[PDB]
Amino acid sequence: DLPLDPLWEFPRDRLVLGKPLGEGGQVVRAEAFGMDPARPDQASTVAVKMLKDNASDKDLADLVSEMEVMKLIGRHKNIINLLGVCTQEGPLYVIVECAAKGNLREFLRARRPPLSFPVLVSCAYQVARGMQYLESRKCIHRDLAARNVLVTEDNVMKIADFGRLPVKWMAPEALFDRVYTHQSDVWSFGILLWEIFTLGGSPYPGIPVEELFSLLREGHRMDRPPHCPPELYGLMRECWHAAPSQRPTFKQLVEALDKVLLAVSEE
Ligand SMILES: *c1ccc([N+](=O)[O-])c(Nc2ncc(C(F)(F)F)cc2Cl)n1
């Protein structure tokens, strides 16, 4: 049910629990000692996922699979990584990376002038690098949005939760046919780009969720954000082609976003 993995077991006594981060299921802040095994007396701030006491056997099974998928996926710079686990003599602890600036939507909204272009292209670019990595590990996100992208102290984008309804982010085949593909996450990426370039704006402003599918079927897409360059808008529109095979891949999006990054950095 919960065996001992030598590659992942962390001593629970080297984990000092703190304030809750989210959920009501729970994510709690903690200070971990020795997350870097070379310097074991060195502390780091970590995020600890655990269940609430009112949780079921099914909730445990789900938390276990999330931990098991995380081990499989392997480490990447732009994903929230698994640091360790506490499985014996107590509650299951799934220890993950902590991102001090919270989610991307919140990061962008708190810095709206009453943050520069290299910073926005760098958010977008990193999310693409992270999504390209997940895709190579055969991982379909299903809910890519700015709120599921976390920001660290060093402005590092880290995609979370990879292992009413968000209608406004879902690719047509996902909303209607309930089919989730890598190409459908590219659609969600197009919406994520728009969220970035509007500094955390709400997709399809003024349009109610119910009137959305008809507008999409008529071939209507969001207009270009107020001061967004057409290269980036062209990418958004490409992400929103009705036909999945006509949308870019995460490889093309990384190549295209890298070019914008050098263009914004060179002069
Ligand atoms: C570290 C320090 C502070 C905060 N915070 O104030 O939100 C966080 N946030 C945080 N990190 C990681 C996760 C996740 F990996 F569990 F999703 C969630 C949150 Cl809220 N980290």
mmCIF file of all heavy atoms in Angstrom, residues 216-239, unseen atoms left out:
data_model
loop_
_atom_site.group_PDB
_atom_site.id
_atom_site.type_symbol
_atom_site.label_atom_id
_atom_site.label_comp_id
_atom_site.label_asym_id
_atom_site.label_seq_id
_atom_site.Cartn_x
_atom_site.Cartn_y
_atom_site.Cartn_z
ATOM 1 N N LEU A 216 -16.659 30.479 -30.657
ATOM 2 C CA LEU A 216 -15.530 29.662 -31.125
ATOM 3 C C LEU A 216 -15.841 28.958 -32.452
ATOM 4 O O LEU A 216 -15.029 29.043 -33.379
ATOM 5 C CB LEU A 216 -15.010 28.681 -30.038
ATOM 6 C CG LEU A 216 -14.502 29.334 -28.738
ATOM 7 C CD1 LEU A 216 -14.178 28.302 -27.684
ATOM 8 C CD2 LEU A 216 -13.328 30.247 -28.995
ATOM 9 N N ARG A 217 -17.047 28.333 -32.558
ATOM 10 C CA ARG A 217 -17.598 27.663 -33.764
ATOM 11 C C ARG A 217 -17.755 28.614 -34.958
ATOM 12 O O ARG A 217 -17.596 28.192 -36.103
ATOM 13 C CB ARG A 217 -18.971 27.045 -33.462
ATOM 14 C CG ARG A 217 -18.880 25.750 -32.715
ATOM 15 C CD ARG A 217 -20.203 25.386 -32.109
ATOM 16 N NE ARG A 217 -20.243 23.959 -31.798
ATOM 17 C CZ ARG A 217 -21.265 23.350 -31.219
ATOM 18 N NH1 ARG A 217 -22.351 24.037 -30.880
ATOM 19 N NH2 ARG A 217 -21.225 22.046 -30.995
ATOM 20 N N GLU A 218 -18.089 29.889 -34.685
ATOM 21 C CA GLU A 218 -18.201 30.945 -35.697
ATOM 22 C C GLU A 218 -16.810 31.442 -36.187
ATOM 23 O O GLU A 218 -16.749 32.259 -37.117
ATOM 24 C CB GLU A 218 -19.037 32.120 -35.153
ATOM 25 N N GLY A 219 -15.727 30.954 -35.549
ATOM 26 C CA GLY A 219 -14.347 31.292 -35.886
ATOM 27 C C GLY A 219 -13.799 32.507 -35.160
ATOM 28 O O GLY A 219 -12.745 33.035 -35.526
ATOM 29 N N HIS A 220 -14.497 32.947 -34.115
ATOM 30 C CA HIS A 220 -14.062 34.091 -33.335
ATOM 31 C C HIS A 220 -13.092 33.724 -32.218
ATOM 32 O O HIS A 220 -13.293 32.739 -31.495
ATOM 33 C CB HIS A 220 -15.260 34.909 -32.837
ATOM 34 C CG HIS A 220 -16.114 35.412 -33.971
ATOM 35 N ND1 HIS A 220 -15.565 36.130 -35.036
ATOM 36 C CD2 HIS A 220 -17.437 35.229 -34.206
ATOM 37 C CE1 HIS A 220 -16.573 36.375 -35.857
ATOM 38 N NE2 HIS A 220 -17.717 35.859 -35.400
ATOM 39 N N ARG A 221 -12.007 34.509 -32.119
ATOM 40 C CA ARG A 221 -10.956 34.380 -31.108
ATOM 41 C C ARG A 221 -10.773 35.730 -30.419
ATOM 42 O O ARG A 221 -11.217 36.757 -30.938
ATOM 43 C CB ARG A 221 -9.617 33.917 -31.745
ATOM 44 C CG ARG A 221 -9.664 32.585 -32.524
ATOM 45 C CD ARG A 221 -10.142 31.433 -31.649
ATOM 46 N NE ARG A 221 -10.164 30.173 -32.378
ATOM 47 C CZ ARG A 221 -11.250 29.632 -32.911
ATOM 48 N NH1 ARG A 221 -12.425 30.239 -32.802
ATOM 49 N NH2 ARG A 221 -11.175 28.475 -33.549
ATOM 50 N N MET A 222 -10.112 35.735 -29.264
ATOM 51 C CA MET A 222 -9.821 36.948 -28.515
ATOM 52 C C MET A 222 -9.033 37.937 -29.364
ATOM 53 O O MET A 222 -8.261 37.537 -30.237
ATOM 54 C CB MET A 222 -9.036 36.618 -27.235
ATOM 55 C CG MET A 222 -9.899 36.106 -26.115
ATOM 56 S SD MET A 222 -8.996 35.873 -24.558
ATOM 57 C CE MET A 222 -8.163 34.318 -24.883
ATOM 58 N N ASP A 223 -9.264 39.227 -29.139
ATOM 59 C CA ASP A 223 -8.536 40.283 -29.846
ATOM 60 C C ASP A 223 -7.137 40.449 -29.225
ATOM 61 O O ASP A 223 -6.910 40.009 -28.103
ATOM 62 C CB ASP A 223 -9.314 41.616 -29.768
ATOM 63 C CG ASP A 223 -10.646 41.622 -30.489
ATOM 64 O OD1 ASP A 223 -10.750 40.971 -31.554
ATOM 65 O OD2 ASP A 223 -11.570 42.327 -30.022
ATOM 66 N N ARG A 224 -6.218 41.100 -29.955
ATOM 67 C CA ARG A 224 -4.853 41.347 -29.508
ATOM 68 C C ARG A 224 -4.794 42.215 -28.245
ATOM 69 O O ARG A 224 -5.292 43.333 -28.288
ATOM 70 C CB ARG A 224 -4.021 41.963 -30.646
ATOM 71 C CG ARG A 224 -2.530 42.081 -30.325
ATOM 72 C CD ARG A 224 -1.720 42.595 -31.488
ATOM 73 N NE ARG A 224 -2.213 43.882 -31.982
ATOM 74 C CZ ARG A 224 -1.841 45.071 -31.515
ATOM 75 N NH1 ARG A 224 -0.971 45.159 -30.513
ATOM 76 N NH2 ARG A 224 -2.339 46.181 -32.041
ATOM 77 N N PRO A 225 -4.170 41.732 -27.139
ATOM 78 C CA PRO A 225 -4.026 42.572 -25.929
ATOM 79 C C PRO A 225 -3.488 44.000 -26.198
ATOM 80 O O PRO A 225 -2.691 44.174 -27.124
ATOM 81 C CB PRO A 225 -3.062 41.758 -25.051
ATOM 82 C CG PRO A 225 -3.266 40.346 -25.467
ATOM 83 C CD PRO A 225 -3.531 40.410 -26.948
ATOM 84 N N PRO A 226 -3.923 45.026 -25.409
ATOM 85 C CA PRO A 226 -3.535 46.422 -25.698
ATOM 86 C C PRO A 226 -2.152 46.786 -26.242
ATOM 87 O O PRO A 226 -2.084 47.608 -27.170
ATOM 88 C CB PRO A 226 -3.918 47.170 -24.427
ATOM 89 C CG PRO A 226 -5.104 46.452 -23.950
ATOM 90 C CD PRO A 226 -4.897 44.987 -24.296
ATOM 91 N N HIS A 227 -1.067 46.218 -25.697
ATOM 92 C CA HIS A 227 0.266 46.584 -26.182
ATOM 93 C C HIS A 227 1.144 45.379 -26.426
ATOM 94 O O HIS A 227 2.343 45.386 -26.137
ATOM 95 C CB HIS A 227 0.919 47.658 -25.277
ATOM 96 C CG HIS A 227 0.205 48.973 -25.361
ATOM 97 N ND1 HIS A 227 -0.660 49.390 -24.358
ATOM 98 C CD2 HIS A 227 0.144 49.858 -26.387
ATOM 99 C CE1 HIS A 227 -1.166 50.541 -24.778
ATOM 100 N NE2 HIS A 227 -0.715 50.862 -25.995
ATOM 101 N N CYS A 228 0.528 44.344 -27.002
ATOM 102 C CA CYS A 228 1.129 43.059 -27.309
ATOM 103 C C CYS A 228 1.668 43.064 -28.730
ATOM 104 O O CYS A 228 0.918 43.413 -29.639
ATOM 105 C CB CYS A 228 0.092 41.958 -27.102
ATOM 106 S SG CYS A 228 0.642 40.309 -27.582
ATOM 107 N N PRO A 229 2.950 42.682 -28.967
ATOM 108 C CA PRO A 229 3.462 42.655 -30.355
ATOM 109 C C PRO A 229 2.846 41.540 -31.215
ATOM 110 O O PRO A 229 2.629 40.430 -30.706
ATOM 111 C CB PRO A 229 4.971 42.491 -30.186
ATOM 112 C CG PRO A 229 5.148 41.886 -28.855
ATOM 113 C CD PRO A 229 3.982 42.263 -27.997
ATOM 114 N N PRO A 230 2.591 41.809 -32.527
ATOM 115 C CA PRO A 230 1.935 40.798 -33.396
ATOM 116 C C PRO A 230 2.569 39.417 -33.523
ATOM 117 O O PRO A 230 1.846 38.472 -33.843
ATOM 118 C CB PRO A 230 1.784 41.523 -34.733
ATOM 119 C CG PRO A 230 1.712 42.990 -34.336
ATOM 120 C CD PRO A 230 2.768 43.079 -33.261
ATOM 121 N N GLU A 231 3.892 39.291 -33.256
ATOM 122 C CA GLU A 231 4.589 38.004 -33.258
ATOM 123 C C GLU A 231 3.940 37.119 -32.193
ATOM 124 O O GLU A 231 3.586 35.971 -32.484
ATOM 125 C CB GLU A 231 6.088 38.164 -32.924
ATOM 126 C CG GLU A 231 6.950 38.612 -34.094
ATOM 127 C CD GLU A 231 7.109 40.107 -34.301
ATOM 128 O OE1 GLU A 231 6.477 40.903 -33.563
ATOM 129 O OE2 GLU A 231 7.882 40.481 -35.214
ATOM 130 N N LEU A 232 3.746 37.682 -30.975
ATOM 131 C CA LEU A 232 3.136 36.971 -29.848
ATOM 132 C C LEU A 232 1.684 36.695 -30.060
ATOM 133 O O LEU A 232 1.250 35.588 -29.751
ATOM 134 C CB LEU A 232 3.387 37.658 -28.500
ATOM 135 C CG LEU A 232 4.805 37.524 -28.003
ATOM 136 C CD1 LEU A 232 5.166 38.681 -27.137
ATOM 137 C CD2 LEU A 232 5.030 36.187 -27.318
ATOM 138 N N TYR A 233 0.942 37.660 -30.654
ATOM 139 C CA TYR A 233 -0.466 37.464 -30.989
ATOM 140 C C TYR A 233 -0.646 36.391 -32.072
ATOM 141 O O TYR A 233 -1.543 35.546 -31.955
ATOM 142 C CB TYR A 233 -1.161 38.767 -31.373
ATOM 143 C CG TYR A 233 -2.649 38.584 -31.572
ATOM 144 C CD1 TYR A 233 -3.472 38.186 -30.520
ATOM 145 C CD2 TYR A 233 -3.233 38.771 -32.819
ATOM 146 C CE1 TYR A 233 -4.837 37.993 -30.704
ATOM 147 C CE2 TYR A 233 -4.609 38.621 -33.005
ATOM 148 C CZ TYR A 233 -5.406 38.233 -31.943
ATOM 149 O OH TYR A 233 -6.758 38.071 -32.132
ATOM 150 N N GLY A 234 0.243 36.400 -33.071
ATOM 151 C CA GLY A 234 0.264 35.399 -34.128
ATOM 152 C C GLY A 234 0.404 34.009 -33.546
ATOM 153 O O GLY A 234 -0.252 33.075 -34.015
ATOM 154 N N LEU A 235 1.230 33.870 -32.480
ATOM 155 C CA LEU A 235 1.433 32.607 -31.788
ATOM 156 C C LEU A 235 0.163 32.194 -31.051
ATOM 157 O O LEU A 235 -0.241 31.038 -31.160
ATOM 158 C CB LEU A 235 2.621 32.687 -30.826
ATOM 159 C CG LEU A 235 4.019 32.575 -31.435
ATOM 160 C CD1 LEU A 235 5.086 32.682 -30.334
ATOM 161 C CD2 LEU A 235 4.192 31.255 -32.237
ATOM 162 N N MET A 236 -0.493 33.143 -30.349
ATOM 163 C CA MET A 236 -1.757 32.905 -29.666
ATOM 164 C C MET A 236 -2.772 32.361 -30.636
ATOM 165 O O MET A 236 -3.316 31.291 -30.398
ATOM 166 C CB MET A 236 -2.297 34.195 -29.051
ATOM 167 C CG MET A 236 -1.643 34.564 -27.788
ATOM 168 S SD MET A 236 -2.281 36.155 -27.352
ATOM 169 C CE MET A 236 -0.821 36.862 -26.584
ATOM 170 N N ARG A 237 -3.022 33.095 -31.739
ATOM 171 C CA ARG A 237 -3.948 32.686 -32.801
ATOM 172 C C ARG A 237 -3.615 31.302 -33.368
ATOM 173 O O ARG A 237 -4.538 30.505 -33.541
ATOM 174 C CB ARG A 237 -4.025 33.741 -33.918
ATOM 175 C CG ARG A 237 -4.649 35.049 -33.463
ATOM 176 C CD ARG A 237 -6.100 34.890 -33.034
ATOM 177 N NE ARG A 237 -6.969 34.631 -34.183
ATOM 178 C CZ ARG A 237 -7.563 35.576 -34.899
ATOM 179 N NH1 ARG A 237 -7.410 36.855 -34.579
ATOM 180 N NH2 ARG A 237 -8.326 35.251 -35.933
ATOM 181 N N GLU A 238 -2.310 30.996 -33.596
ATOM 182 C CA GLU A 238 -1.878 29.673 -34.072
ATOM 183 C C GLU A 238 -2.275 28.575 -33.072
ATOM 184 O O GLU A 238 -2.730 27.507 -33.489
ATOM 185 C CB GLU A 238 -0.369 29.629 -34.344
ATOM 186 C CG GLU A 238 0.042 30.280 -35.654
ATOM 187 C CD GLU A 238 1.536 30.338 -35.908
ATOM 188 O OE1 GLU A 238 2.293 30.661 -34.966
ATOM 189 O OE2 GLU A 238 1.954 30.074 -37.059
ATOM 190 N N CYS A 239 -2.135 28.858 -31.752
ATOM 191 C CA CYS A 239 -2.503 27.944 -30.659
ATOM 192 C C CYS A 239 -4.022 27.678 -30.681
ATOM 193 O O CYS A 239 -4.465 26.596 -30.311
ATOM 194 C CB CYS A 239 -2.048 28.489 -29.303
ATOM 195 S SG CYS A 239 -0.247 28.522 -29.057
#
